Amino acid sequence: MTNRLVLSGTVCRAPLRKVSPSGIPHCQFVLEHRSVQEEAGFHRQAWCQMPVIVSGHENQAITHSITVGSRITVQGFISCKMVLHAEQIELI
Amino acid sequence: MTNRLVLSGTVCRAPLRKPHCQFVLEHRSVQEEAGFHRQAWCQMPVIVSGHENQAITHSITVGSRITVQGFISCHMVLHAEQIE
Fold this sequence. Notes:
Chain B: Belongs to the PriB family. Two copies of one chain form a homodimer. Chain A has one helix spanning 60-63, and strands at 3-19, 25-39, 42-55, 71-79, 83-91. By secondary structure, chain A is mainly β.
């Protein structure tokens, strides 16, 4: 059932944008995550460069406010090379 | 900042107790996207460290259906905090 990733980070690659023949807009960028996480009582650095895709009309708008350096939080499902398919985007 | 993955799947690689247990989780689901249903698939390496989750771990065998929660890190692996 469950497949949900919430990941904050800094955009390290600006949105590449395109539209399919059928008229579906797609936007792809990369989210660089860095943080300290707790695991079994010890602090450890977590790092990931996560490709993000925003598909469909409904979330394209906010995307135009995202550039390299933008701090955001993306919520969505992962699909595998791994990509995070954005369902929600929060501008930090 | 936020780093939280909740993933359900089937164990495709039997847990090897290395102090941490490591295995691979195969996920397959149908997800909704841009008006359409799109299948999603991943084979996620999972690491469970913490004696709290070591009883459940050693029951798990390939084919077991579990739900895991934790943070992701790229060496990509899921460092599991909880596992049902």
